[PDB]
Each structure stands twice: as C-alpha cells, then as structure tokens.
Design an enzyme around this catalytic site. Structure first.
Site, PDB file in Angstrom:
ATOM      1  CB  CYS A   1      -0.930   0.058   1.211  1.00  0.00           C
ATOM      2  SG  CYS A   1      -1.873  -1.429   1.567  1.00  0.00           S
TER       3      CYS A   1
ATOM      4  CG  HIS B   1      -2.736   3.588   3.004  1.00  0.00           C
ATOM      5  ND1 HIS B   1      -3.402   3.110   1.906  1.00  0.00           N
ATOM      6  CD2 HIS B   1      -2.529   2.523   3.813  1.00  0.00           C
ATOM      7  CE1 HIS B   1      -3.664   1.826   2.079  1.00  0.00           C
ATOM      8  NE2 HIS B   1      -3.130   1.442   3.222  1.00  0.00           N
TER       9      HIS B   1
ATOM     10  CG  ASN C   1      -6.296  -0.735   2.101  1.00  0.00           C
ATOM     11  OD1 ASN C   1      -5.710  -0.261   1.134  1.00  0.00           O
ATOM     12  ND2 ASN C   1      -5.651  -1.243   3.140  1.00  0.00           N
TER      13      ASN C   1
END
Ligand code: NA
Ligand code: NA
Lengths: 358, 358
Positions: free
Chosen positions: B111, B249, B279
């Site tokens: 990520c 994020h 996500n």
C-alpha cells in the site's frame, strides 16, 4: 554532485545442476542442438525460494563491501519470480539480514530488472539521502517452465546476484544509462496466465502457456540493446575502443556476439557465463559482474558496458566507471541449506504433471 | 536543480459496488461493525484486470496534463496484484497507450507503493534525463480475498489512480520524502502462498491464508507513518501548521485520525474517501489526490503531506509543494467496458468456492 560506487558484489547459484543431456532424457532435444543454438551447457535448479537465493547473494555482497546492515538505506530486488506478492520479497531479504528501516521494494522489468534496479538505486542516491543500497537480481524461473515445451524449457535457470552501492564524490559507479521498453513487442515473450489474470479456482491453472517467439525476440533484443548502447556511448563521450569490458545479459551467446559484432566491440571483452547457468533473467548481469570481478577480468578505473533485454520488451544499457577496489574486503560463510537431490530429482514432480497433462 | 511537477492526475474506479450490507449477506458481520471499526461503507469490485484500471487512470492523467504519449520517458505501476509477472503490467499500459520507448516497470511495496513510485520517479527525473513520467497505483485486491474470513474480506477494494510528472526548475512536486520498511513486522500482513512459493500443481492452491494481525498492524502503521512524517517535517523546515492538506493512505479512518491527532494536524485537513472505496492498496493515495483536486480541496502553492504503510511493513511520508495549476488541461472520454453485473454477481463464483472448501 555524487555517485553510487559499487563497493560490494556477490552471488548465489543453487547446487542442483541440469545438463543438456539431462534435458534430452525427457525432451525431444539434444546437447548439440541446445549448445550450438544458445551456448548453454548447464543450468541450476533451486531447491529453495527466490528470496533465499537473494539473501545469500546479499550476504556475500555485504561482506564484500564491509558495510554494516545498519548502514543500508535501500533494498531493491529485481525479480519476476517472487516467493510472494504480499508482502514483497525485498522485505524478506531485509528481515533475514536484520536491516532496520531501509526502503525495500521489488522491481519487475524481467531480464532487464537488474539494470533497471542499478539505475533506480543510483539516481535515488544521487538526488536524495540514501547512503548505501543493496540491489539484487534473483530468480527461480524453473517455477514457470513447461517441461514438455523444448523451445523454452532449455533456456532458463535459477540464481541470484547482488551489489552493494555506497555514496561517494568520486566519479565512479553507474554514469550514463538508457533504459526503455518496446511495448509493441510485449506479446512475443510472456506467461500471461500467472498473476491475477489467472483463474484462481480452476484446477488446470498450473498448465499455463509460455509464449516465446524466438526469432522476433532475437531481432528486437539486438536492436534495442544496440541502440541503448549507442546512446550511452554517445552521451559519455567515449569511443567504442575505450570500453574495457562488456557485462551483458546472458540470454543467448549469439545475441551477445551479435551485439558486440555490430557495436564494433571486440568479442573477447564480453564476459560470458551462459554455458554454466543459462538465462537466469534478472540475475544474469549481477552474477556475471561478480564473476568477472572474481576472475580478475575487470581492472580499477575500467569502463564497463552493461546491456540487457527481456519481457516487455524491456531493454537497457549502462556505462559503469570502476573505482579503485576490485577485491572483496571480506567474505561470508553464508550458504544455502544442503541439497541431497539432483536437478532431475527436484524437477521430477513438475515433469510428470506437465507430461501427464498433454 | 530541478523538480518533478505533478501536472496530471486521474482515476479509475470500477462500477460494481459492494456495500456493507452485501457483505453481511454471506458473512457473519454487520454494517455497524464494519462502519464503526473502519469507516468503510462501500468498495468497488473490478470486472476487468488490474492493467485495464491502470490504463484508464493513465488516460485521464495524460489528458489532465496535456502531454503527448510521445513525451513520456518513464512508466511506473505500483501494484501487488499484477495481471501477470511475465511480462510486467507497466508494459501493458504502455502498449495500450502507444507510448514509445519509455522505461516501464512494476514496483511492489504494497500500500506504500504509490509513494515509493512517486519518490522513485522524482529522483530519476532529478538526477537523469527523464522529461515526463507516469506513476500509477493500481490494484485488483478482490483477487486475493477469502470470502469466509470477515477480518480481511471487508477491508479491501479495487481501483487505480495515476499522476503525470513533468520536469521543471520551479520548486514544486515532491520535495523531501522518507520511505522505509519495518521488516521485523513482515509476517503480520501477508499472503505467503500466492507467488512462486505456492505449489503450482496442487489443486487446493487457490485456498491460501491471508494473515492479518489487525491490532499490531494498527500500532506499527501509526508508529511508522508518524515517524516518517516527523522526519519530512523536520527536514523541510515547515511547522505542522504550514501543512495545508494531508493525503493519507486509506486503510482505516481511525489510523488516519490517530496519525493526524498525534502529529498535531487538524483532522479536517485530511482528505478521506475510504467510506466509498475501502483500502485499494497502492491506489489509495493517487485516487485521494485526484479527488482532492477535483473537489477543490487543494489550492495552488499548498503544502501537502502524504503518508502510507502496508505489507512489509513498508511505510513512507512525503511533502509535495503544489504549483500553479489545480485544474485539468483536458479530459479523456476513456472508460471501462460496460459491466452488466452487480458486485455480488461478480464475486458469486469465488464466494461459492471459498464457502465450499471450509
Ligand atoms: Na577505458
Ligand atoms: Na503552507
């Protein structure tokens, strides 16, 4: 202005060895055919994961550089055969070696990946704070192969090579580099059905096609590497005569010879170890560099040309100006777990599955 | 001295939408539980490959920048869910868009990959010849999920975001950045058995574990992103008050709020779209940036803080100084093929396989 000196070099070749004759025992091929066509005589088959090979190559390069794991700020693993995607295997190497804090990523540009990694690490170091870096080319290509397809089954092998880079004001390490990709050629060298394009729940999903249009690959490789080499030479202000050593990707000895022949570079300047290891994709260049150095083929202050190409069709060339030291500062006793099996024993299961499916 | 201005931004969210209630229909969970725990209300499930999402996000970013495909020298796709490993999917995006010659590679740092990509592209441009770059975060995480495991099945979604970078002498784009990885934590967030560590010929190889130690991840994420943010702030000579916008994020809204709360940054500066998309790993940051810009949340000359973390445990922060333009120079009508199926229809097969195997 600063530079990323190659202060450490290292390699990991797994022990299990698959000769041309071995291949002939389950494949409609011959040692004559393989050897005359490609220059390959042997290749290695890993009994461990890619990250394990990467790790040993790293330990040797670290020992060679005399740098502390605490000083490594960046880790790049160039691979197209990672143990896992989540997480990356750069982080496994990091975990294994106890390196704190360093940026760690996997870079995939196929067989050009080590050159892409060297370029990336060098520019990261030149423009920002990274003091030392570890750049590793590592592959277990034997994972991918279809043992009933002779065109590709005889070309590829497993292994890893690594370098450590260290920041310096001396004009050494990678100087100019041109990396690129001929995407119009993407389809000629591919395994399109391993990755998230594959059907996770289809029980035949292991039997994927390995597309390899050999002749068009050869043409496009010679063109791409040759043009990249021209650009680096032109920008460097060096004549072809001033290149001391070529460290080429090891896909085919004829590609190596053609590249040299067409660039006007003497054939004996090209370091070749394809006969021992075949095509280990991202590992070819760093293994060749390490062995060139081990064998005394590179002298201090030499100008090196690196060149590579691979699936993509990615391509690249680079000029490395060597510094003062061509000997290791120390050695590592790191090693792979012992392996009690010949290559043929290791591949046994895969060969049976592939043959059973035809 | 030069800089890599963000001149283009773009996004691709597939249409099929999986609500919290949908998940509750085949999973022992609730909308209340998911929403209060994570902040997530919906996420997207792709009917196409990762590279397809990447491609549309790229087309929009290219149109936004008004740059020619002929001018792009570098393409990075940050992903951990590539269509294929051989070749990389950066080359597919390249092929799709008709970009000649550009270096093209996949970068895997989970990520944190988009931030790793932005840092890498910026430093490549600063230290060498690259005039323009395309950096794309793209994922089809739905590939990986175990639809019987509620801890992870409710967290992740699919999508892509992209930027175009352009070289300039103005002090804009990414300024300081600190990227890193806490490898001692590698095992807390992992799918160790997709990749070359998996048994290619085992018919149960689709039923892999998705390791997710939620609480330790939360702790290590807040620590790593927070420390990275401190370093960037300290080196920049900016106070926390001078940060105009945070583009974090999007893993969990509580992580976002904690990060801000602990850094002393006002909560309303943090752009949040996790409620819509969940996500999407490497895509979270570039989608958020694109939408922040679309919504007028960023003004010219603003100081942005980016922060991310992921499997590895990779982590990073960066300071972006915005330039003059926050509106697109043009638009793309590029779109995904039409999809006639709800998210539930798309996942149908996978949900049945996972449930059948328990
Ligand atoms: Na020379
Ligand atoms: Na400001």
């Amino acid at each position: 202005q600063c530079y990323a000196e190659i202060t450490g070099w290292g390699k990991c070749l797994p022990p299990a060895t698959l000769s041309n004759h071995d291949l002939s025992t389950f494949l409609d091929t011959s040692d004559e055919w393989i050897q005359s066509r490609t220059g390959i005589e042997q290749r290695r088959i890993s009994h461990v994961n890619t990250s394990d090979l990467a790790t040993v190559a790293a330990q040797h390069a670290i020992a060679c550089a005399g740098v502390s794991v605490e000083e490594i700020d960046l880790i790049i693993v160039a691979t197209c055969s990672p143990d896992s995607l989540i997480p990356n295997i750069a982080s496994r190497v990091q975990q294994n070696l106890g390196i704190p804090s360093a940026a760690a990523f996997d870079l995939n540009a196929a067989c050009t990946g080590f050159l892409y990694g060297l370029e990336t690490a060098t520019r990261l170091m030149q423009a920002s704070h990274y003091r030392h870096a570890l750049v590793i080319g590592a592959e277990r290509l034997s994972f991918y192969l279809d043992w009933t397809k002779r065109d590709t089954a005889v070309l590829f092998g497993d292994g890893a090579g690594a370098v450590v880079l260290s920041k310096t004001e001396q004009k050494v390490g990678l100087q100019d580099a041109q990396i690129g990709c001929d995407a119009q050629g993407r389809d000629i060298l591919a395994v399109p059905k391993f990755g998230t394009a594959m059907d996770r729940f289809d029980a035949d999903n292991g039997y994927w096609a390995f597309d390899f249009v050999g002749k068009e690959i050869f043409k496009r490789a010679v063109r791409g590497m040759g043009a990249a080499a021209q650009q680096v030479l032109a920008r460097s202000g060096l004549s072809t005569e001033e290149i001391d050593v070529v460290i080429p990707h090891q896909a085919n000895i004829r590609i190596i010879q053609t590249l040299c022949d067409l660039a006007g570079i003497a054939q004996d300047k090209a370091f070749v170890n394809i006969h021992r290891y075949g095509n280990t994709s991202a590992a070819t260049v760093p293994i060749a560099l390490c062995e060139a150095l081990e064998q005394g083929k590179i002298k201090p202050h030499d100008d090196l040309l690196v060149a590579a190409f691979g699936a993509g069709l990615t391509w690249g060339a680079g000029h490395i100006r060597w510094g003062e030291r061509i000997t290791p500062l120390g050695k590592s006793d790191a090693q792979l777990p012992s392996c009690d099996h010949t290559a043929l024993d290791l591949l046994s299961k895969a060969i049976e599955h592939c043959k059973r499916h035809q």
